[PDB]
Scaffold this active site. Structure first.
Site, PDB file in Angstrom:
ATOM      1  N   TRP A   2     -13.736 -14.913 -12.185  1.00 12.41           N
ATOM      2  CA  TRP A   2     -12.321 -14.892 -12.579  1.00 12.41           C
ATOM      3  C   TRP A   2     -11.734 -13.582 -12.092  1.00 12.41           C
ATOM      4  O   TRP A   2     -12.114 -12.521 -12.619  1.00 12.41           O
ATOM      5  CB  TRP A   2     -12.121 -14.985 -14.092  1.00 12.41           C
ATOM      6  CG  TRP A   2     -10.663 -14.935 -14.464  1.00 12.41           C
ATOM      7  CD1 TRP A   2      -9.882 -13.828 -14.580  1.00 12.41           C
ATOM      8  CD2 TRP A   2      -9.814 -16.051 -14.750  1.00 12.41           C
ATOM      9  NE1 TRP A   2      -8.588 -14.174 -14.926  1.00 12.41           N
ATOM     10  CE2 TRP A   2      -8.520 -15.534 -15.044  1.00 12.41           C
ATOM     11  CE3 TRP A   2     -10.014 -17.440 -14.787  1.00 12.41           C
ATOM     12  CZ2 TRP A   2      -7.436 -16.358 -15.376  1.00 12.41           C
ATOM     13  CZ3 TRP A   2      -8.930 -18.265 -15.113  1.00 12.41           C
ATOM     14  CH2 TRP A   2      -7.657 -17.717 -15.409  1.00 12.41           C
ATOM     15  N   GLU A  17     -17.765  -9.390 -10.298  1.00  9.49           N
ATOM     16  CA  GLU A  17     -17.603  -8.724 -11.614  1.00  9.49           C
ATOM     17  C   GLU A  17     -19.054  -8.265 -11.938  1.00  9.49           C
ATOM     18  O   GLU A  17     -20.003  -9.047 -11.722  1.00  9.49           O
ATOM     19  CB  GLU A  17     -17.198  -9.745 -12.664  1.00  9.49           C
ATOM     20  CG  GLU A  17     -15.738 -10.203 -12.598  1.00  9.49           C
ATOM     21  CD  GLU A  17     -15.564 -11.472 -13.401  1.00  9.49           C
ATOM     22  OE1 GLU A  17     -15.334 -11.382 -14.628  1.00  9.49           O
ATOM     23  OE2 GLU A  17     -15.716 -12.571 -12.803  1.00  9.49           O
ATOM     24  N   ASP A  56     -15.035  -5.780  -9.075  1.00  9.28           N
ATOM     25  CA  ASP A  56     -13.880  -5.941  -9.960  1.00  9.28           C
ATOM     26  C   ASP A  56     -14.336  -5.523 -11.337  1.00  9.28           C
ATOM     27  O   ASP A  56     -15.013  -6.318 -12.045  1.00  9.28           O
ATOM     28  CB  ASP A  56     -13.488  -7.434 -10.024  1.00  9.28           C
ATOM     29  CG  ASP A  56     -12.352  -7.713 -10.983  1.00  9.28           C
ATOM     30  OD1 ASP A  56     -12.001  -6.818 -11.795  1.00  9.28           O
ATOM     31  OD2 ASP A  56     -11.803  -8.841 -10.916  1.00  9.28           O
ATOM     32  N   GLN A  85     -12.620  -5.658 -16.553  1.00  8.32           N
ATOM     33  CA  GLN A  85     -13.102  -5.687 -17.919  1.00  8.32           C
ATOM     34  C   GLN A  85     -14.231  -4.721 -18.227  1.00  8.32           C
ATOM     35  O   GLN A  85     -14.332  -4.237 -19.369  1.00  8.32           O
ATOM     36  CB  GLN A  85     -13.531  -7.119 -18.318  1.00  8.32           C
ATOM     37  CG  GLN A  85     -12.298  -7.949 -18.682  1.00  8.32           C
ATOM     38  CD  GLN A  85     -12.595  -9.231 -19.402  1.00  8.32           C
ATOM     39  OE1 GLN A  85     -13.366  -9.255 -20.352  1.00  8.32           O
ATOM     40  NE2 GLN A  85     -11.951 -10.322 -18.971  1.00  8.32           N
ATOM     41  N   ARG A 103     -16.619 -14.158 -26.680  1.00 11.65           N
ATOM     42  CA  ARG A 103     -16.549 -12.928 -25.883  1.00 11.65           C
ATOM     43  C   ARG A 103     -16.080 -11.884 -26.899  1.00 11.65           C
ATOM     44  O   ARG A 103     -14.909 -11.875 -27.321  1.00 11.65           O
ATOM     45  CB  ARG A 103     -15.527 -13.053 -24.730  1.00 11.65           C
ATOM     46  CG  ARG A 103     -15.883 -14.118 -23.671  1.00 11.65           C
ATOM     47  CD  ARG A 103     -15.028 -13.957 -22.387  1.00 11.65           C
ATOM     48  NE  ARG A 103     -13.610 -14.314 -22.550  1.00 11.65           N
ATOM     49  CZ  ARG A 103     -12.635 -14.008 -21.676  1.00 11.65           C
ATOM     50  NH1 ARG A 103     -12.895 -13.325 -20.558  1.00 11.65           N
ATOM     51  NH2 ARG A 103     -11.386 -14.396 -21.918  1.00 11.65           N
TER      52      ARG A 103
HETATM   53  C1  PMP Z   1     -12.640  -9.568 -14.301  1.00 14.71           C
HETATM   54  C2  PMP Z   1     -11.121  -9.813 -14.271  1.00 14.71           C
HETATM   55  N1  PMP Z   1     -10.409  -9.430 -13.145  1.00 14.71           N
HETATM   56  C3  PMP Z   1      -9.039  -9.585 -12.966  1.00 14.71           C
HETATM   57  C4  PMP Z   1      -8.329 -10.179 -13.983  1.00 14.71           C
HETATM   58  C5  PMP Z   1      -6.783 -10.341 -13.755  1.00 14.71           C
HETATM   59  O1  PMP Z   1      -6.028  -9.350 -14.417  1.00 14.71           O
HETATM   60  P1  PMP Z   1      -4.474  -9.632 -14.650  1.00 14.71           P
HETATM   61  O2  PMP Z   1      -4.361 -10.809 -15.462  1.00 14.71           O
HETATM   62  O3  PMP Z   1      -3.989  -8.427 -15.338  1.00 14.71           O
HETATM   63  O4  PMP Z   1      -3.744  -9.782 -13.330  1.00 14.71           O
HETATM   64  C6  PMP Z   1      -8.964 -10.623 -15.199  1.00 14.71           C
HETATM   65  C7  PMP Z   1      -8.240 -11.262 -16.298  1.00 14.71           C
HETATM   66  N2  PMP Z   1      -8.223 -10.553 -17.412  1.00 14.71           N
HETATM   67  C8  PMP Z   1     -10.354 -10.424 -15.317  1.00 14.71           C
HETATM   68  O5  PMP Z   1     -11.035 -10.804 -16.415  1.00 14.71           O
END
Ligand code: PMP
Ligand code: K
Ligand code: NA
Length: 431
Positions: free
Chosen positions: A136, A208, A241, A244, A404
């Protein structure tokens, strides 16, 4: 009360629905680890809002810096620099691993993954992007094209050159070698398939360090290093990324410091703005120089705005000063032991995983079959709210519902225990 007919009438008449359902309450105040409804009822915020309030709600030092810059230096023409911007950029270079030198200050997590992905395509001269099948990265174009846990249907073709490989998932292993789960061999097998599908234009792999929406899937020992080597062999950049996992949530300043593997580009967001829309990417001096020679462009309204940057610097100052990375381990361990205690009592808890204050609890119908429960999962979540504990469960095919759990890094021992108590009571009454 929460039943304000006029509020709910306006909500139904004037809001675009964007996923899920809206909670049946009107939130009027927030402080520390709690949010308060219209009756003044305290709700323990065990998700830090939408996983961003690492300092808790309305921290006095954030209130302070916000007021100060809102009244003195707010928003500027994007070619104008100011001290909060150069200071935050410098602080990020100093606290991220060696080899990460230059930062770009943006607004949202998807936007930061977009900036990273564009930079990779530009410096490699290529365009194929590979992510995990349970990932995600956001709702915008390229971030969505690399997002596989949800959102791929009904909205037309994904970006040209979008591929996914399975994530290494120790609780539900599907790749066996000599009687055991060989996730490293699974990675080699996946990359050989990628290589055959590719047009010879692999630009990057985005990952991630702990897949959140995907079900709190933590990359196991030696995996991230092996992933980086797959990328190096193919002239691909590794983008991590940490929307989180960054800024201390998992018990290290950045999750990538645990494996000691340094990505080519690091993206940050949620936790960095602590509730406010601030995000960033950090890359090496060699990559930034090349991108600049090639004409890299990512010019937005709020890139380098002083108020968001002053807030992020204050967030970092507090995390460092108050040792909140260490607190994530101390409160994280206290929370995890309590979750394992519940696992001892309730047979529906099939697994407790994660790291620091990013924990996951998978609900199952049978502990030997690992058959998902989910109907049960939603029930527990419903009871938790009734009991004054805000939780969030994620559901993906072939997996039980997964809670979570991610409390503020400023959460107290008493707050962790209250959360653990309410959860236990919620499970008792959901069964
Ligand atoms: C790992 C991760 N990366 C990017 C995002 C996208 O962030 P945003 O909704 O602020 O654009 C999310 C959503 N929370 C996420 O969980
Ligand atoms: K600006
Ligand atoms: Na660095």
């Amino acid at each position: 009360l929460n039943d304000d007919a006029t509020f709910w009438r306006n909500a139904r008449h004037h809001l675009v629905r964007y996923g899920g359902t809206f909670e049946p309450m009107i939130i009027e105040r927030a402080k520390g680890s709690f949010v308060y409804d219209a009756d003044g009822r305290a709700i323990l915020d065990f998700t830090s809002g939408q996983m961003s309030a690492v300092l808790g709600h309305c921290h006095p030092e954030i209130v302070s810096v916000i007021g100060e810059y809102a009244g003195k230096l707010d928003h500027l023409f994007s070619e104008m620099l100011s001290r909060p911007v150069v200071d935050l950029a410098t602080r990020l270079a100093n606290i991220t691993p060696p080899g990460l030198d230059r930062a770009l200050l943006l607004s949202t997590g998807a936007e930061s993954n977009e900036a990273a992905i564009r930079m990779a395509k530009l410096v490699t001269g290529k365009y194929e992007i590979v992510g995990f099948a349970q990932s995600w990265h956001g709702m915008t174009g390229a971030a969505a094209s690399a997002t596989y846990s949800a959102g791929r249907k009904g909205v037309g073709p994904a970006a040209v050159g979008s591929f996914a490989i399975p994530a290494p998932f120790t609780y539900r292993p599907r790749f066996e070698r000599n009687g055991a789960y060989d996730y490293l061999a699974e990675l080699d097998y996946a990359f050989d398939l990628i290589d055959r599908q590719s047009s010879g234009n692999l630009a990057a792999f985005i990952a991630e360090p702990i897949l959140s929406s995907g079900g709190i899937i933590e990359l196991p020992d030696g995996y991230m290093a092996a992933l980086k080597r797959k990328c190096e062999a193919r002239g691909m950049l590794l983008i991590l990324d940490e929307a989180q996992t960054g800024v201390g949530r998992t018990g290290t300043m950045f999750a990538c410091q645990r494996d000691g593997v340094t990505p080519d580009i690091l993206t940050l967001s949620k936790t960095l703005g602590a509730g406010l829309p601030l995000a960033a990417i950090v890359t090496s001096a060699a990559i930034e120089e090349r991108a600049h020679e090639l004409g890299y462009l990512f010019y937005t309204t709020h890139v380098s705005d002083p108020l968001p940057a002053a807030v992020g610097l204050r967030v970092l100052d507090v995390v460092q000063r108050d040792g909140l990375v260490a607190r994530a381990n101390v409160m994280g361990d206290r929370l995890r032991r309590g979750l394992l205690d519940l696992m001892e009592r309730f047979d529906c808890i099939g697994d407790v995983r994660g790291r620091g204050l990013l924990l996951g609890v998978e609900i199952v119908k049978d502990r030997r079959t690992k058959e998902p429960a989910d109907g049960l999962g939603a029930k527990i979540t419903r009871e938790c709210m009734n009991l004054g504990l805000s939780m969030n469960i994620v559901q993906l095919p072939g997996m039980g519902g997964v809670f979570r759990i991610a409390p503020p890094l400023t959460v107290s021992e008493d707050e962790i225990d209250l959360g653990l108590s309410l959860l236990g009571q919620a499970i008792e009454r959901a069964l």
